[PDB]
Amino acid sequence: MREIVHIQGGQCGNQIGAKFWEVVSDEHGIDPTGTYHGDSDLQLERINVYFNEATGGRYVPRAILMDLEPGTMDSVRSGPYGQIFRPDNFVFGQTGAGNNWAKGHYTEGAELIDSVLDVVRKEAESCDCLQGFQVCHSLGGGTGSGMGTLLISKIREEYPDRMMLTFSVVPSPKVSDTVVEPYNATLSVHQLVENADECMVLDNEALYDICFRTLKLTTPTFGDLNHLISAVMSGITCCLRFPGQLNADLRKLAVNLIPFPRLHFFMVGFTPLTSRGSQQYRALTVPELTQQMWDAKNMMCAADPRHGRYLTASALFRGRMSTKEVDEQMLNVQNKNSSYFVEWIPNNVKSSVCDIPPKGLKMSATFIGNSTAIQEMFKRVSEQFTAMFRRKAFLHWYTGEGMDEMEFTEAESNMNDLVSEYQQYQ
Amino acid sequence: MREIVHIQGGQCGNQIGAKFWEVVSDEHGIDPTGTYHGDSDLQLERINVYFYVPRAILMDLEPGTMDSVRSGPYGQIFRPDNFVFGQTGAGNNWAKGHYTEGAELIDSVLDVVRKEAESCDCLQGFQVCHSLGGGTGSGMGTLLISKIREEYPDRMMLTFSVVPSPKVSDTVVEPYNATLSVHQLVENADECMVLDNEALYDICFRTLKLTTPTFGDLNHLISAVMSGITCCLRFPGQLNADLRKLAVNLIPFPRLHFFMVGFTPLTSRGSQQYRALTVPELTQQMWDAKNMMCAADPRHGRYLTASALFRGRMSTKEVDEQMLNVQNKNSSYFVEWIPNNVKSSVCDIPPKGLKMSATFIGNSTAIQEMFKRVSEQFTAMFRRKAFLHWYTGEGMDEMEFTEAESNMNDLVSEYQQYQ
Amino acid sequence: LYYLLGERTRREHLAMDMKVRASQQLKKDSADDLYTLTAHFNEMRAAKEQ
Amino acid sequence: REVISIHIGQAGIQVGNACWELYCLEHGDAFNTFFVPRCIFLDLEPTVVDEVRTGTYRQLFHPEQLISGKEDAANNFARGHYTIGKEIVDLALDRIRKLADNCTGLQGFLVFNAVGGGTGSGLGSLLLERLSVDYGKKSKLGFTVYPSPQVSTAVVEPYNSVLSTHSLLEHTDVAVMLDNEAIYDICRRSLDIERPTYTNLNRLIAQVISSLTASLRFDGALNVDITEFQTNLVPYPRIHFMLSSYAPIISAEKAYHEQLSVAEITNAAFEPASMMVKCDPRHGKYMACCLMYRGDVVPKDVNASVATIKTKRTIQFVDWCPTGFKCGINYQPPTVVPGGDLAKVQRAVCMISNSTAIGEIFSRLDHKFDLMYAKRAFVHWYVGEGMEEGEFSEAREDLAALEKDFEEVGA
Numbered sequence A: 001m002r003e004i005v006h007i008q009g010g011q012c013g014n015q016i017g018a019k020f021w022e023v024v025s026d027e028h029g030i031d032p033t034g035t036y037h038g039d040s041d042l043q044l045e046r047i048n049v050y051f052n053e054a055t056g057g058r059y060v061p062r063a064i065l066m067d068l069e070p071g072t073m074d075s076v077r078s079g080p081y082g083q084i085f086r087p088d089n090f091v092f093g094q095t096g097a098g099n100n101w102a103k104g105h106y107t108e109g110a111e112l113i114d115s116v117l118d119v120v121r122k123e124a125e126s127c128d129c130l131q132g133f134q135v136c137h138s139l140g141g142g143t144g145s146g147m148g149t150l151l152i153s154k155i156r157e158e159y160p161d162r163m164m165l166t167f168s169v170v171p172s173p174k175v176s177d178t179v180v181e182p183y184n185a186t187l188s189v190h191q192l193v194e195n196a197d198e199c200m201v202l203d204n205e206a207l208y209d210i211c212f213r214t215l216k217l218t219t220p221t222f223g224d225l226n227h228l229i230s231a232v233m234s235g236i237t238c239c240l241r242f243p244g245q246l247n248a249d250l251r252k253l254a255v256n257l258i259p260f261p262r263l264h265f266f267m268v269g270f271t272p273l274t275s276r277g278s279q280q281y282r283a284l285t286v287p288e289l290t291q292q293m294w295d296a297k298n299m300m301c302a303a304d305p306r307h308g309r310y311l312t313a314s315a316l317f318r319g320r321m322s323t324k325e326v327d328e329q330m331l332n333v334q335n336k337n338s339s340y341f342v343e344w345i346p347n348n349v350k351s352s353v354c355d356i357p358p359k360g361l362k363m364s365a366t367f368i369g370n371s372t373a374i375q376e377m378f379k380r381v382s383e384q385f386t387a388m389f390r391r392k393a394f395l396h397w398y399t400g401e402g403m404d405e406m407e408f409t410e411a412e413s414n415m416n417d418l419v420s421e422y423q424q425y426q
Numbered sequence B: 001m002r003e004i005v006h007i008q009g010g011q012c013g014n015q016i017g018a019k020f021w022e023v024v025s026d027e028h029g030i031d032p033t034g035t036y037h038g039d040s041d042l043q044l045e046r047i048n049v050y051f052y053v054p055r056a057i058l059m060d061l062e063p064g065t066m067d068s069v070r071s072g073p074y075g076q077i078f079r080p081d082n083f084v085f086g087q088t089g090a091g092n093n094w095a096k097g098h099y100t101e102g103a104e105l106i107d108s109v110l111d112v113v114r115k116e117a118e119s120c121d122c123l124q125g126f127q128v129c130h131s132l133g134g135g136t137g138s139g140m141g142t143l144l145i146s147k148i149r150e151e152y153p154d155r156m157m158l159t160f161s162v163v164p165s166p167k168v169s170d171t172v173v174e175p176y177n178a179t180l181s182v183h184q185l186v187e188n189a190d191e192c193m194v195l196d197n198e199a200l201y202d203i204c205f206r207t208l209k210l211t212t213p214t215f216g217d218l219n220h221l222i223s224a225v226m227s228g229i230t231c232c233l234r235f236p237g238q239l240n241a242d243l244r245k246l247a248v249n250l251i252p253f254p255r256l257h258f259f260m261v262g263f264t265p266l267t268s269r270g271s272q273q274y275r276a277l278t279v280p281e282l283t284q285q286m287w288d289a290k291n292m293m294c295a296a297d298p299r300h301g302r303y304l305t306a307s308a309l310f311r312g313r314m315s316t317k318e319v320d321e322q323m324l325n326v327q328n329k330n331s332s333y334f335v336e337w338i339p340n341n342v343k344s345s346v347c348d349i350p351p352k353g354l355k356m357s358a359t360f361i362g363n364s365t366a367i368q369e370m371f372k373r374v375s376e377q378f379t380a381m382f383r384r385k386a387f388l389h390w391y392t393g394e395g396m397d398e399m400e401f402t403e404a405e406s407n408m409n410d411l412v413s414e415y416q417q418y419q
Numbered sequence C: 001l002y003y004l005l006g007e008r009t010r011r012e013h014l015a016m017d018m019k020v021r022a023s024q025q026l027k028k029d030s031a032d033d034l035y036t037l038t039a040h041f042n043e044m045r046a047a048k049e050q
Numbered sequence D: 001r002e003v004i005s006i007h008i009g010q011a012g013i014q015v016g017n018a019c020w021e022l023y024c025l026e027h028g029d030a031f032n033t034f035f036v037p038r039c040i041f042l043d044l045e046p047t048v049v050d051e052v053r054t055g056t057y058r059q060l061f062h063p064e065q066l067i068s069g070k071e072d073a074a075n076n077f078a079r080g081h082y083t084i085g086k087e088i089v090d091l092a093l094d095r096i097r098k099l100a101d102n103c104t105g106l107q108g109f110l111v112f113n114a115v116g117g118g119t120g121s122g123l124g125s126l127l128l129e130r131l132s133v134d135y136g137k138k139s140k141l142g143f144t145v146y147p148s149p150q151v152s153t154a155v156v157e158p159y160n161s162v163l164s165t166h167s168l169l170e171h172t173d174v175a176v177m178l179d180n181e182a183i184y185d186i187c188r189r190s191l192d193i194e195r196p197t198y199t200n201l202n203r204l205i206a207q208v209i210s211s212l213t214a215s216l217r218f219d220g221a222l223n224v225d226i227t228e229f230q231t232n233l234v235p236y237p238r239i240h241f242m243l244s245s246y247a248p249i250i251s252a253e254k255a256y257h258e259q260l261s262v263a264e265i266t267n268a269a270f271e272p273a274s275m276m277v278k279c280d281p282r283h284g285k286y287m288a289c290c291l292m293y294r295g296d297v298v299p300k301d302v303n304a305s306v307a308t309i310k311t312k313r314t315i316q317f318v319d320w321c322p323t324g325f326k327c328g329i330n331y332q333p334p335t336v337v338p339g340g341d342l343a344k345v346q347r348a349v350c351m352i353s354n355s356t357a358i359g360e361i362f363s364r365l366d367h368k369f370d371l372m373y374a375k376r377a378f379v380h381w382y383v384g385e386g387m388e389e390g391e392f393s394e395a396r397e398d399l400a401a402l403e404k405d406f407e408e409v410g411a
């Protein structure tokens, strides 16, 4: 019935989804060949939301990998659970954009977007009742940010009635890989505020913090970071896939968390995440799950919400849980730290429970908090953007491609009025 | 009971027909030695339609094609008396292949086909595989069509004809042959299924994703089409539709008998197990414009009529909502003064290797583009009489090319008129 | 004198070649414009039939 | 499916000494089209013929087939046409008749001659005249050697070339031009033989001949017989002179390093630096091309290569012919000769096209002929042999008509 299609853009997007399809297919008990081998029938009744039966027990994931470099796609197909994607969905250029938002939005976008749109159209009309779309990309690169954002714009002109998620990492000053990060972040966000339904902001700085303190990994490569991100993303859309005592679908969660149409950048967390050293020394009860959820040091963004105020918040619980204990524990953490919560909305937290924990655990949680501290990030990025544009550094690699100076003034103006209006609602 | 006689002309026709009898003999379970080894008894009941020695007549003007026929497998199954065969060779000269060399081979090919026709009781029709670019294939095959209609006027007649395209151009005198061949086809053949190598190479690039599509696979694709179109005779179905019923459902006007063809399912070896086999999925591959086997995009015009022959255990209900959906969705691409422009048919026996197959036959009005695409090249060459003396010094005069021009010109006019 | 006449003629012939190359670009993209624009005409045609 | 080959003059039979060495080596039913060979060497000087009689192929050739006269033609068209030809030509054609009688499905004759000499010009034209009377309808493939502009071994060769071409118009049906200076440049540039002789030239001429007859000897994916060149390449009855080229003419060292495929060799067959005639096809406009493919070649890439050629603009095509190609694919790879200077190749291409650059060659020859003739230099030798003053001027005006024909058709 309700259906979600998957879209992965750029190199970062391709690896995130690869670990995602491995984890989900594991949850449904499908082996890397693509055949059903599950035990109960709780798993079989809701595999139409993500997969399609092909022939004689063959289930193919409904995903589309889209990028511009051959190596990135090849790596997903070499590894396990790479042999499960349908080869038609490997929409793929040949030249390359290379961290140029202009090349990703005007030069190479204009000749690849039509083809990936055809795959998206076929994948959308292959199902009956759309629930929404799911896009993973970055905001620093060019082939993921600019191309992916134009993909978002094309969809809003095609399907304006359906939902839309975008999982986007943002560049930080402390974790700053490339040099054209501000010229990409400002224009990408500019297009995100006018096209995306809701955006769930991520960043690499917070990812490094979690992997040192809580996870205590020795060599945290990208496989494990994507392991965290995939477990969190599965937690959002568990409610469409499994029955629970209190169901909260995506559109239900969106209308509960977005008080104003422009205020749709969310901060995330996940529980429980422990080292294998301290796994044996704690229990699994609702208090241990809630304190690790609402910890500011456990958030999956580098924006301390304790530097602002929570507008609304949501928690999606998984496992055989009692809703009485759910709201009383949620109410307790909302009453003590009352100053961090907005005043003119009582009970700022929407909550839901699902009865199927992930494999290997008895109880997990996922936090999605629409805070106001995100204005710090836009200031922290916009000042770097303004610093370069005042004396035109790197300007000609975009200007000589088709953008003018008025496009940058537009991008800064929209960020400026957004930060001003976030500060107003603060 | 109902009988189909096969006739293969020219080098192109012979190699297509060689692959055709390979596939049919495989379906009927007859070994390359000529003895039955099949499993089901449904195949024995309707094997007289094609047979165990095949009921075919190969005809050409160069021994290489005949030698290459008996060399390969399923070459020991033809009756050596049916290898009616000249010796000199026309060689890409329509006048030679239609007046000079035909005038002495045609009497012998007519004798063998007449013996092969009266050998059975009730003919359904004839089935001719040939080209429109070469000389000994097009011209001789064309004259054979005219001679047959004089002797057998009430019998059906199929012509699987490939046409030249400027993107895939073999010889230099291609338009001189294509224009004249059409001039005879428009008044002689009952219906023609237009093919061309450009669309075939394009299919093997995108859908089949083959690296080196030699002539074996192209002839394999055309063969699958010809096996699919006559499945209704050879096997019972939940709704039968023989050759005659397709013609009367598809041809609204007596000069509109040039069809475009497609086939489903066609998938690469890599994506072979990653796919499903459902009626809606086959319909999206049927009505795709990049799946027609002509270089005439049907979405540049309107459809007049269309048909889909299905094979396999199917539910007729699914057939009807898919056909009505495709008609109600894209209502501009279909003609307005005929409601329910789609004819359908079901047969219970799939081709060997598949569970569910389909064959599309679309009578569109986008065909006038390719015919104008041809008349352009012909017009320029004829104006300064290029290459004309190799035809004129044989009996052909100038008014013949003008007559073929007029027939080419007024055909595309009435396609535009009915558009 | 002839050694330099040759250089001026070579310059003139190259000035024509880079022009010929630019002319092919105009030919190609204009063909693309016809395909996209006739699609626009069909869409408006479809709109009025409905 | 049989074709007989006659060889005229010192140049014709030396070329034949390479052709038949290649044929017998290649065939070690397919041999029926050539095999005793179906040949007649004929010459007016017995020195080169007796080289064949005492050579290694003493037993291969039937003794009568080797025709040899008693005295030379003295590099005089007139002497080799009216004085000495009259005695040898009757014996030659009395042999060709019963060789054709032994055959059943004769495709045609193919002749080898050089137009600069006396025998190749004089009795070569005479033999072609009487064959046209006797058969007429059968194709005659004329592979001539015209004299080069700057490289020359004779003095009066303009006289012979004009006087030979005048009959070469209405007698041969297919005529292939091969200069010597151009092939010298080919063997120097691509084969890197700095000191070539006639033997190397004659070896790669045989490679070209074998490539265009391989469609008869062996079955291919797309066969093309001797009647196809007759039709697909001759747009008008008076324009039959074809540029030839072959690829890859590569030395052993270079070939292994190079990746030979259809697209690049189809390109290499169209540059003027690899043609068998010193002429500039850029100066002309192509009428129709014919592409012979041998070896591992599928129809896709030959069609892909021909598409890239038609879209390039350094070479232009005529307006009266949009589809100006006739391709042909054969399975058998080209054979090699031990001692030959070519390496084994997976696939080779022979191009035979028609353009108006040839129209430039005839004007260049006419000027040299015109200069000497006005003051009647060297005319008295031919007149004493039996000719007169009339036929020089009338042959001159015949070439003038041909120049006008090329300028008009190219318009």
Ligand SMILES: Nc1nc2c(ncn2[C@@H]2O[C@H](COP(=O)(O)OP(=O)(O)OP(=O)(O)O)[C@@H](O)[C@H]2O)c(=O)[nH]1
Residues within 6 Å of the ligand: A245, A246, A252
């Ligand atoms: N007593 C009791 N109340 C329940 C139970 N489940 C849900 N509710 C109540 O239902 C209220 C919200 O309405 P729901 O029934 O959950 O949702 P809905 O009415 O279908 O509306 P939608 O969410 O838009 O589908 C909450 O206030 C809960 O108190 C239950 O199992 N027992």
Ligand SMILES: Nc1nc2c(ncn2[C@@H]2O[C@H](COP(=O)(O)OP(=O)(O)OP(=O)(O)O)[C@@H](O)[C@H]2O)c(=O)[nH]1
Residues within 6 Å of the ligand: D008, D009, D010, D011, D012, D014, D015, D044, D045, D072, D073, D074, D075, D076, D080, D114, D116, D117, D118, D119, D120, D145, D146, D147, D153, D180, D198, D199, D201, D202
């Ligand atoms: N390619 C090639 N050309 C040759 C060869 N021998 C002579 N020629 C050419 O032949 C022309 C000179 O005329 P010849 O062939 O020698 O005259 P001929 O055929 O012997 O006639 P006569 O000498 O009068 O008996 C020049 O163009 C020579 O380059 C050869 O072995 N190979």
Ligand SMILES: Nc1nc2c(ncn2[C@@H]2O[C@H](COP(=O)(O)OP(=O)(O)O)[C@@H](O)[C@H]2O)c(=O)[nH]1
Residues within 6 Å of the ligand: A009, A010, A011, A012, A013, A015, A016, A099, A138, A140, A141, A142, A143, A144, A145, A169, A177, A178, A204, A207, A222, A223, A225, A226
């Ligand atoms: N979490 C995570 N981040 C990644 C991964 N690969 C790349 N990144 C981030 O992506 C940023 C650069 O984006 P890039 O890959 O060039 O984007 P694209 O080229 O447009 O597809 C860097 O700051 C990395 O931190 C990954 O596997 N996991």
Ligand SMILES: Nc1nc2c(ncn2[C@@H]2O[C@H](COP(=O)(O)OP(=O)(O)O)[C@@H](O)[C@H]2O)c(=O)[nH]1
Residues within 6 Å of the ligand: B009, B010, B011, B012, B013, B015, B016, B091, B092, B131, B133, B134, B135, B136, B137, B138, B162, B164, B169, B170, B171, B197, B215, B216, B218, B219
């Ligand atoms: N599909 C297909 N087409 C072929 C084949 N062989 C030749 N052709 C086409 O036929 C045309 C040449 O026809 P030809 O065989 O010379 O006809 P003929 O000389 O009269 O026998 C070319 O344009 C080819 O594209 C084949 O095996 N399959």
